[PDB]
Symmetry: D2
Subunit: 307 residues, 4 copies
Amino acid sequence: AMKRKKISVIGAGFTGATTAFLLAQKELGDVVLVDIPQLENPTKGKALDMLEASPVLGFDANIIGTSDYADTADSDIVVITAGIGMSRDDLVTTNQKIMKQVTKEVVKYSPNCYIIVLTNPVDAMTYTVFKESGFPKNRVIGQSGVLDTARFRTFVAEELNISVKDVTGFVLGGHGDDMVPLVRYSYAGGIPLEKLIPKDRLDAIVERTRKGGGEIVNLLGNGSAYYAPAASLVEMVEAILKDQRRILPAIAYLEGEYGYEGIYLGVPTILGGNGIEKVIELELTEEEKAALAKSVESVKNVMRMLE
Amino acid sequence: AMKRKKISVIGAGFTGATTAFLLAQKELGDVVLVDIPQLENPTKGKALDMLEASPVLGFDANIIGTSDYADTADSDIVVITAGIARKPGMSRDDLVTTNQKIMKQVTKEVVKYSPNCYIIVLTNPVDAMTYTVFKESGFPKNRVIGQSGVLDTARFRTFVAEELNISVKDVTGFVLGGHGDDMVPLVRYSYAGGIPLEKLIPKDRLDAIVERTRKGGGEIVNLLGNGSAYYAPAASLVEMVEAILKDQRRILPAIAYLEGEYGYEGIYLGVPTILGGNGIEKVIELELTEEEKAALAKSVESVKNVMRMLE
Amino acid sequence: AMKRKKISVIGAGFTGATTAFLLAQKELGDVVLVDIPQLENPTKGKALDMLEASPVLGFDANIIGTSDYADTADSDIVVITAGIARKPGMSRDDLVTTNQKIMKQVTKEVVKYSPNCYIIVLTNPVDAMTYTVFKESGFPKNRVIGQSGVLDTARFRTFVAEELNISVKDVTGFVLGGHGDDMVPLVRYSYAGGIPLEKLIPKDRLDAIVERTRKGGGEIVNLLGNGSAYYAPAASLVEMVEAILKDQRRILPAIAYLEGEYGYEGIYLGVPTILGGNGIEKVIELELTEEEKAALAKSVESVKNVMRMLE
Amino acid sequence: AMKRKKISVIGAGFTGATTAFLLAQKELGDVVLVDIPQLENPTKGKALDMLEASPVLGFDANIIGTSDYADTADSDIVVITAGIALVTTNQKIMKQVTKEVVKYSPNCYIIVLTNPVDAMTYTVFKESGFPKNRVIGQSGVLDTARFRTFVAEELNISVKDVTGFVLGGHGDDMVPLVRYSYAGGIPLEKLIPKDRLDAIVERTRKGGGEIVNLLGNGSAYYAPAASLVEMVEAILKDQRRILPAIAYLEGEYGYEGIYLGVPTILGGNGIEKVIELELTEEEKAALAKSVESVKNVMRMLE
Ligand SMILES: NC(=O)c1ccc[n+]([C@@H]2O[C@H](COP(=O)([O-])OP(=O)(O)OC[C@H]3O[C@@H](n4cnc5c(N)ncnc54)[C@H](O)[C@@H]3O)[C@@H](O)[C@H]2O)c1
Ligand SMILES: NC(=O)c1ccc[n+]([C@@H]2O[C@H](COP(=O)([O-])OP(=O)(O)OC[C@H]3O[C@@H](n4cnc5c(N)ncnc54)[C@H](O)[C@@H]3O)[C@@H](O)[C@H]2O)c1
Ligand SMILES: NC(=O)c1ccc[n+]([C@@H]2O[C@H](COP(=O)([O-])OP(=O)(O)OC[C@H]3O[C@@H](n4cnc5c(N)ncnc54)[C@H](O)[C@@H]3O)[C@@H](O)[C@H]2O)c1
Ligand SMILES: NC(=O)c1ccc[n+]([C@@H]2O[C@H](COP(=O)([O-])OP(=O)(O)OC[C@H]3O[C@@H](n4cnc5c(N)ncnc54)[C@H](O)[C@@H]3O)[C@@H](O)[C@H]2O)c1
Ligand SMILES: O=C([O-])CC(=O)C(=O)O
Ligand SMILES: O=C([O-])CC(=O)C(=O)O
Ligand SMILES: O=C([O-])CC(=O)C(=O)O
Ligand SMILES: O=C([O-])CC(=O)C(=O)O
């Protein structure tokens, strides 16, 4: 008997929905879209509106909304986007319990699933999910590398006036100040960008990448990015579901890699049927090594804010 | 030096934004997303967040957010989802009228910078609002269309897919007239891989599917609480956009301007149509049963009702 | 471990190659192109060529070429196209026996290495060649499938599409019976956007179209001069493969072991089918006219008259 | 009135036919299949077989087979695959081909595949009367794609994440830069030692012959048709890709008066510009050994 893949997308907000919707139209499998019971009606409203567009886009996928994790039973992938002028401490603590509470139900109804976390801060929350899940390091990944690279590509595209298919960004660690960009491993059709873009403009593109998610927040006035984040999540689900062995930047457990371990950190990754198949150790220059250390201690910080 | 197509989506709300997103990702061309001046930053927020997903999904489109119609310069297709939704305290006539003025302000600007474009109208009441854009655009009837029956058949097909547990791709569906009580389904022209549905589903459930397809927009309003359908409505718009942009000569129900078709004239109404590169190519004039001919009459008195509400 | 679906395409000729290329392209799995040892070199040269396309079209599928059934191990779907064509000074009986022979020798080696595969058969005469495969496979009826209906309705839809000047998306067809002459197309079950084709095409034009579809294959071999159609055939195979692999529960006309449906038993025939993750989920029994029951018995007559040449 | 993009595939054999299907499949537009009027019927039934697959795959595309060039009227793109499974034999086809092609589609971009392609595209360029951006060759997209394959098998990572770059002719004329190839963006020199990297460069070079040598009585059509289509799509969708492509140099790299595989921007106006990679002392010397052969083939012409 052939069964289509089953993907459960927890949190039915702006990214979780846009994600659920891409997942459906591509026919990567049936999508179960979960939120708290107070938002179950909306979440079934957002499932069904999506599913009523299944005749029109000509895609065969089931899309249901629910407040009940029994609907998540036997998922291949689980993507967690669930999350809430307030302190860093109370954001990390608040989202952390939500990570613990989402996880216990997820792994319970989905024992052999791969989990992809988006939740902010995705460095410490994927940690929380890794921990809480019990799962071996390969089955728990965070998104942040692919969205940063994607921002930098777009900027590098609209600067050279070429295709986004031809620009490859290389981002290490998390977002903004925690970002360790590798421009030397960034190209336009394999041409090092550092020979196409002048430093001042390239330094600008780096900082805008850093300031990329804040920038959308200020544009919207109410909320953060969901389109590009959503597209980031799907592409990593596409990698696992189709064992594509993608080299993409992911948030990943480190067990000695770059001389660090017992943390999550955004690193070069091979993405396939066993989720994270290989963390990749680059040989890094002295500035990169030292800037990575800032970013590692900047993640050990939020992890001191975990309870 | 023959370049990308240009689609401008007026209103950067849930429908305009979702629709713009689908358009770009199918590389149907460059998308200019347009809303009011207060909401320029949020629009640009939506178009920037879209474009930034393009290196991920591997589609090459320009997408911009803007309240300056300069940016819609020489658009091939224009989708109007620019609209008020019901304001608690509003009469039918106030919405109807509030929305018409928006059509006039939006249309004027659309033919100013894109006088040789094709216009697809979602704004409620769509029957009355596509008419507004036709008589203010000064366009030929073929260059201005309303979306309505795609979303109603897409709804109908899902419930029928769900009843018979078969691919939505092999379920079809026919409706003339509008949404709600205006909707004029032909079960006799609805099927499952070419088996008329009446042979497959009992009468209680089949009537039940029709009823669910009148109330279909309401179903989605009641579940969300605030807001309305966007994904199904956006896909629908995208089907009609795709038809015209690729000259597909599809047979879709669209809101088109009758000039004697079914012996009605000077109006827009949901009729079967060829949709292709000349917009609405033909209105298909079916031979209906007296029943159908007369339920369509009720449906057309409805469209007249609203039409008497235009200032 | 999440693993990709594995498909094996027996016979690396025009149809089997093409099928292997389309499958690869859709990322529907890993593809194993399988001919006789004498054509192993050219079969590996196709698989590599196909695989060398994948950086360009942008799919990750693994394609290799073998004579050896060992690289078909634990295959989910096997698509049997392997066969010989008509050789001059050879009768009906000797192509049938020779192909049957091949059907039997391919299948003992397919069901050894892939015991829980679904098998889609193309080899002409398909209805008997499907029947052989089902006897030698010892698999239940739902796992052994033939292609013929989708090819022919595609041919029919293409002729109506030409005839009306509309997209083929909105043309629906339905054909029971084998191929060529022994082919039963229901014009009453054929529509252009849900509208019966009898209301749109006059009877001379609609009968001739029905006649072009009967001769549909021969038309192409007469134009080619040397060999039979491969694009339309391989596409047909892919939709059927895709329906099993994404459990899409399509209503498709497939070749299916009849066990009382349409008043027939103990044969494989073109019939209505729901094609899903469990192969042939169910044959759908239509209400036919006596003209159609006699028209289908004519097909079964030529079909059974072919089955007789077996052993 | 909105109207389809039209693509005439000149050559209705293995590469010509395989290209037109894909093109129709992707809905890049309407497709005229062409060959000699002898082979008018085999063409037409390639055209019909393909158009008969459209209901099943579900793409709206007119695919027609013809030997009358009138039916290739108004083509946006013209794909030249008319050759013989001899630079003088394939030269003399280009000349008769190009004259009718500029005559029905005078506005059209010409992407050529016929071997020896840099010399056959050059021959197309000279008869065409068109600008240097309007006549393109296909080489590096195929060789590079053979490279990314071999580099994909070797590391077992996605093909999508392998990058490649080959400058120069088709065969032992190829000068791919292993230092402008990567896997995940991380240079291959760092991922693969010199004896196995040398082997991938070697296998890339023989690439075409490996395909001939297995097949027995033809050459490559699946990777070649995809390579053409990618280049069609760049022009038809103004994609503005940086693809390896055969391009008429007028100074570039201190070479001119010759077609040769070089980095380019490929998009709406065809080849918009060729890109000048500054090269290691042995890449320049090696590019020259490739050209100096290439030039000879053009002293095989007329
Ligand atoms: N890495 C990134 O891409 C990135 C960028 C944007 C968003 N984010 C983070 O991703 C998350 C998603 O944000 P969004 O834009 O989708 O916002 P949103 O508020 O619209 O979505 C959040 C949803 O999660 C639900 N939720 C909250 N607690 C839950 C619980 N215990 N169980 C189940 N559902 C619960 C809420 O009810 C809400 O529907 C946030 O934490 C945000 O900070 C980070
Ligand atoms: N007829 C149908 O088939 C159908 C289906 C669903 C939606 N609709 C209609 O579509 C309309 C809006 O749909 P939505 O769900 O996206 O709503 P929405 O309110 O979220 O989005 C509408 C957007 O239009 C903008 N707008 C208002 N007046 C404008 C003007 N003069 N110029 C430019 N932009 C302007 C608003 O700022 C808002 O952002 C409503 O009238 C709704 O009834 C009808
Ligand atoms: N059902 C349909 O609609 C339909 C349409 C087209 C073709 N067909 C039939 O399908 C078959 C395929 O024809 P084609 O166009 O590919 O012709 P072809 O001869 O080019 O392809 C068939 C291939 O089968 C191979 N083969 C033979 N014996 C084999 C064996 N024991 N194991 C493995 N491979 C073996 C041959 O070596 C040959 O390469 C024919 O029997 C044809 O009549 C039916
Ligand atoms: N240079 C490259 O990048 C590359 C890659 C693969 C193939 N090729 C070349 O592609 C070309 C075609 O290859 P193929 O494998 O399709 O061969 P093929 O089997 O298609 O033979 C060439 C086709 O062109 C037709 N043709 C010949 N003269 C013609 C004329 N005067 N007008 C119109 N059509 C004519 C032939 O009848 C035949 O259909 C050959 O030159 C081959 O060497 C080179
Ligand atoms: O925290 C934010 O500002 C949002 C963010 O990082 C992101 O979008 O990736
Ligand atoms: O009016 C509304 O609320 C929206 C609507 O018609 C629909 O979705 O069909
Ligand atoms: O019938 C034939 O001769 C070949 C065939 O199956 C087809 O193409 O339909
Ligand atoms: O020489 C040939 O026949 C074609 C060729 O270069 C190739 O396939 O790479």
